[PDB]
């Protein structure tokens with residue numbers, strides 16, 4: 001199962017890891033993708049997860065969008081986890097660089113409560129432009145299920161752990 005995680009709360013764990021390598025190792029039931037409403041997995045966590053699936057995640061996602069239309073900011077959909085997980089929960093956190101409402105971050109984390117255990121990144125962090133310290137706070141105050149957070153950046157991981165209240 002999940003190894004080397006630091007326990008933050010009753011249900012939130014954190015590790016300095018590449019979520020792709022973590023998913024390939026653990027093969028979790030659910031890996032969370034830091035998705036956008038169009039499921040265009042170009043960069044950040046989404047680009048990395050999609051590249052690990054040899055673009056199969058993008059092909060599946062394009063068919064999903066053709067059928068259903070775009071997701072809402074704060075929403076999610078469950079698709080295949082391909083070679084990374086049983087399922088991928090594509091969750092859209094607000095993108096601060098596109099001027100989206102940061103208050104939607106709690107709605108985005110609420111999607112995690114539909115899954116007993118997840119491997120996930122910090123929503124709206126990285127190229128989505130939100131403060132990762134704030135994202136971790138919203139995560140711990142919103143998610144009640146077991147969430148294993150993978151933080152790619154070592155310096156950010158250290159800052160997150162050392163400043164955790």
Ligand SMILES: Cc1nc(C#N)c(N)o1
Nearest residue numbers: 018019020044045048152
């Ligand atoms: C290549 C890569 N970039 C990230 C991020 N963020 C990741 N998980 O893997």
